[PDB]
Subunit: 242 residues, 2 copies
């Protein structure tokens, strides 16, 4: 059957990613961003108690999904890509956003786009890929014919640091955060080529979840009334870099 979430306490997994989920050390931690605002909209509308739980550091996106599937959270909200492999083990709400990926590199690097990766212009071990991301599965399917021959990265920070230090030549990033970081944080990083892997972000829930309909109806309502677009503008329509 089904039921409403009013009165229910949800352990909500979130995962650090600026400006979706922003973690500030203050003197304890304070969370802000698109995700926290979305949670407030849902909490206010649906009446659950939000127990927001930040995933341990270097928890991967796949790791978060697996932790939820094992019972560690009730839902997980973030820049979490809906994939076939994940859908085998968890359900997803209606999509909160479209998504695609872009190629991230250091400015001045002689790469014109994806054909340069697919034609072997870049040594495979100088392509950095964040393990436990949807981008890893894309790489393995479309670039390397299944071979794990990329330079593995444990976090976005390692991705940025390795690019800037010249340890890797390129990586992949979701478009929203890719634009955000290159337009606001690392002015010397840039995006190149057409976007790829058109996909979506969804809220992760247990399979056959009692509260599936309540959540979906609410997400769709926020879509239809322009709230999701408002939140995207609020958090993403900014550019500090000259």
């Amino acid at each position: 059957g089904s039921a409403r979430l009013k009165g229910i306490t949800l352990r909500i997994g979130v995962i650090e990613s600026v400006p979706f989920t922003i973690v500030a050390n203050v003197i304890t931690t304070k969370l802000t961003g698109y995700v926290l605002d979305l949670i407030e909209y849902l909490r206010d509308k649906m009446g659950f108690v939000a127990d927001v739980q930040l995933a341990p550091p270097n928890t991967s996106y796949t790791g978060l999904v697996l932790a939820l599937a094992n019972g560690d959270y009730d839902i997980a909200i973030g820049d979490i890509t809906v994939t076939s492999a994940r859908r085998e083990i968890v359900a997803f709400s209606n999509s909160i956003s479209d998504n695609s990926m872009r190629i991230l590199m250091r400015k001045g690097t002689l790469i014109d786009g994806m054909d340069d990766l697919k034609n072997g212009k870049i040594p495979y071990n100088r392509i950095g890929i964040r393990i436990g991301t949807a981008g890893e599965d894309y790489y393995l399917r479309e670039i390397s014919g299944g071979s794990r021959n990329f330079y593995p990265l444990k976090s976005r920070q390692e991705m940025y640091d390795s690019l800037l230090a010249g340890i890797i030549d390129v990586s992949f990033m979701d478009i929203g955060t890719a634009e955000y970081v290159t337009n606001n944080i690392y002015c010397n990083l840039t995006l190149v080529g057409e976007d790829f892997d058109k996909s979506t972000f969804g809220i992760v829930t247990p399979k056959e979840w009692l509260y599936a309909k309540d959540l979906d109806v609410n997400i769709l309502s926020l879509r239809e009334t322009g709230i999701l677009d408002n939140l995207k503008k609020k958090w993403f329509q900014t550019k500090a870099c000259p």
Copy 2:
């Protein structure tokens, strides 16, 4: 619980909409299009037995959803918009396509965008709306404050004929089919303004369906491997108009 669809007969509701589901006579009816190709892809991967059932000629999109909810079909596949109100009574698969709407008009008409409809540049009886479509709920929320004061249309054909005959000045149409019709069939109709009501198309299923996971995993696999993009290119890239 859950089950796989292999060997199981699915009654699949489809609805006329070129080039998603294209209906030809000779007496017998022949069906072709993106939808029919998609059914074949899913059938081959999942192993179900497809019992494809064209909805009666005058069936509306809301009517199709309600027919499914009533048990008249097992799933429905088409250019069917995922909306909050529909999600109250049926579930939807992971999206098969993004969607948005555009303003449809005769070439030459002096309309800049949605502002003209909101500012009252157009008499309400000269705005045609196809009843029982998602666009009707958009009109009611954004334009008329709940009043059904539009020129009601019973079909796309009535929409085109009424625009060409000058009985109405504008209507709304989903972008995929709007581009197709104005680029191939009605060369003297055109689209104007920014797209609006960003949404998705999904396969309609019963709520709490036994087979939800099997279907979603397979749809996401078709997305990831590029089949959905191939199908879109195949059916929508054409442009016959000079």
